[PDB]
Structures are given as structure tokens and as C-alpha cells.
Amino acid sequence: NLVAEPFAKLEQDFGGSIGVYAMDTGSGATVSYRAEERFPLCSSFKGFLAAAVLARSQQQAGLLDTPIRYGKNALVPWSPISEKYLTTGMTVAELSAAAVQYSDNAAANLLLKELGGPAGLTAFMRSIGDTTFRLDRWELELNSAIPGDARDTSSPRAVTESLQKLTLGSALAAPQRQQFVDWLKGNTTGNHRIRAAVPADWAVGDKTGTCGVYGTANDYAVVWPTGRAPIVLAVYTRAPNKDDKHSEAVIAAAARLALEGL
Ligand SMILES: *[B-](O)(O)[C@H](Cn1cc(C(=O)O)nn1)NC(=O)CSc1nnc(N)s1
């Protein structure tokens, strides 16, 4: 597989495993490397969480506009937006934007509670035809990333296929698809990952994840190249030792190879 050789060299130099899937939504061309292997989702589950909340909001009039007046016992580490608005509250739309664009942990757990927990989000992903995705735990326990543990994992391929259905296809009603795309476009946490592989004039929406242990981190994106149909892609990493470091540079490098191979 000569297409795969640069990815094998990249993951060997990194000291672990890289999983990549990219789809050109115009031509149907793909790039695939360990694309059906499981990797931990880490905070990347929060994009799909936001999409699941948008789907619920189609049926529950005014859900996205509802103010949530959470207390301090809803807060957990790395919740910078939830802490800032503790004395104000946040609407469900605001919580969703915080979870997607700042990876806010408390906001994500509040929205999981709205959906019926990790099982609720898994059920939503099954409803759009994703058989691989599983969320089992809440923030912060879902980040353990233990090698060979299937909890809180998906595959690059299933992430890309589900992202395409939600951002570009008909899984959400159009005004909800558009809100999901705008949240991903406004992400603040991904400037050194897929965004670093994209020409500056191309629009991007992405969601990152970082477990940190076991070299585990990831990004997935929709990318709108000038004059072309959009690309959807996912890059996930892991490594065998608890102390192995993740690399944003390796994610960006894998994304560059994926765009080059399409
Ligand atoms: B997430 O489950 O990855 C969550 C918070 N977070 C978001 C991001 C990101 O989007 O890249 N990174 N971390 N992780 C945790 O709360 C605990 S595991 C780590 N947290 N920060 C790290 N850096 S590793």
C-alpha cells in the first residue's frame, strides 16, 4: 500500500498509531489509514454531543433558548466558560458553543445530562447509522485512554461518516445543521491541528480532543476548499505507554498527507 507508507513512517517516528480517514464529498475519493481501528474520543465527543442537542431541539420548542441556572457542583476542571458565567447561567445554545469551541467540561456534562447521559448520546449516534461510536463515561473519567479499552472510542472512518451526515447531509434539519457548522467554524482549540494543514483561504470547522496519556489526541473537521466540494476528515492518535506524549504536529502532518492524497 504505497499511499499508506508516509502514514506508517509518521506513526513510527511518533512512537504509536495514527488513524486517518478523509472523504472528498464531490468525487467520493478517500484516504484511509487504520481508518476502522478504535481510538479514544477524548473531548472530540463534544461535537457529536452538540449535534445530538440540536436534534433534540427540533422537537422541544425553545430548548436551545432555555437558560440553565447551574450551581458550582456542576463545575469540573477545565470549564473556563462555565465558571465565567456561573453567576449568570447559560442557555443550552451557549453551553453547546462552550463545549464545542472551548472544550468546556462542565458545559459538556450539563448537556449530557439533558440527553440521558453517555447512553443517550450513543443512542443518538446509532439513530444516524453510526454502529462504532460509544460513549460510556462523563468528563473527566472518559479520558483514561487505556490501550485495548473500547469505552469512549470510535474510529476515524465512523467519525468522518457521522460528521458528513450532520454537517452536510440531512441528519439534522437545515437550521440545526447550520448552527452545528457555525459552532465548529468558531472553534478556538484547533489552530495547531487540521487547521495548520489547510491553506489560509479555506474555511474550516473542527473539534479537538486530548486525553494526553498514552499519546492520545485527535481532531476532526469539515474543510471547504476554494472552488471545490467540501472535505470531511478525522485524525486520531494513540501510543502504548501511559507517559507517551501526544503531538499536535503529527496530527497536522497526517492531515497534510490526507489532503495531498485526495
Ligand atoms: B477532553 O475530554 O479532551 C478534556 C478537556 N480537553 C479538551 C481538549 C481539547 O479539545 O483538545 N483537551 N482537553 N480532557 C480532560 O479534561 C482531561 S485529559 C486532558 N485534559 N487536557 C489535556 N491537555 S489532556
Residue numbers in the entry: 27 to 57, 59 to 252, 254 to 290
In the authors' words:
The KPC β-lactamases present a larger and more ominous global threat. Boronic acid transition state inhibitors (BATSIs) have the potential to become clinically important BLIs, which would add to the success of FDA-approved vaborbactam, as they possess a boron atom acting as an electrophile that mimics the carbonyl carbon of the β-lactam ring and forms a tetrahedral adduct with the catalytic serine that closely resembles the transition state in the hydrolytic mechanism. In this study, the activities of two α-amido-β-triazolylethaneboronic acid transition state inhibitors (S02030 and MB_076) targeting representative KPC (KPC-2) and CTX-M (CTX-M-96, a CTX-M-15-type extended-spectrum β-lactamase [ESBL]) β-lactamases were evaluated.
MB_076 was designed to improve oxidation stability and hydrophobic interactions in the active site of serine class A β-lactamases, replacing the thiophene ring of S02030 with an amino-thiadiazole ring. A crystal structure of KPC-2 with MB_076 bound was solved at 1.38 Å resolution. The unbiased omit map contoured at 2.5 σ revealed density for MB_076 being covalently attached to the Oγ atom of the catalytic S70 residue. MB_076 was refined to an occupancy of 0.8. The two boronic acid hydroxyls of MB_076 form stabilizing interactions and occupy the oxyanion hole (formed by backbone N:H exchangers [NHEs] of S70 and T237) and the deacylation water pocket (formed by E166 and N170) of KPC-2. The carboxylate binding group of the MB_076 is situated in the β-lactam carboxyl binding pocket and forms hydrogen bonds in the active site with S130, T235, and T237. The carbonyl oxygen in MB_076 interacts and forms a hydrogen bond with N132. The C-H of the triazole ring is polar and can form a 3.0-Å C-H—O hydrogen bond interaction with the hydroxyl of S130. In accordance with our goal (to improve hydrophobic interactions by its thiophene ring) the CH2-S-thiadiazole ring-containing portion of MB_076 engages in hydrophobic interactions with N170, the main chain atoms of C238, and T237. Furthermore, the amino-thiadiazole ring forms intramolecular edge-to-face π-π interactions with the triazolyl moiety of MB_076.
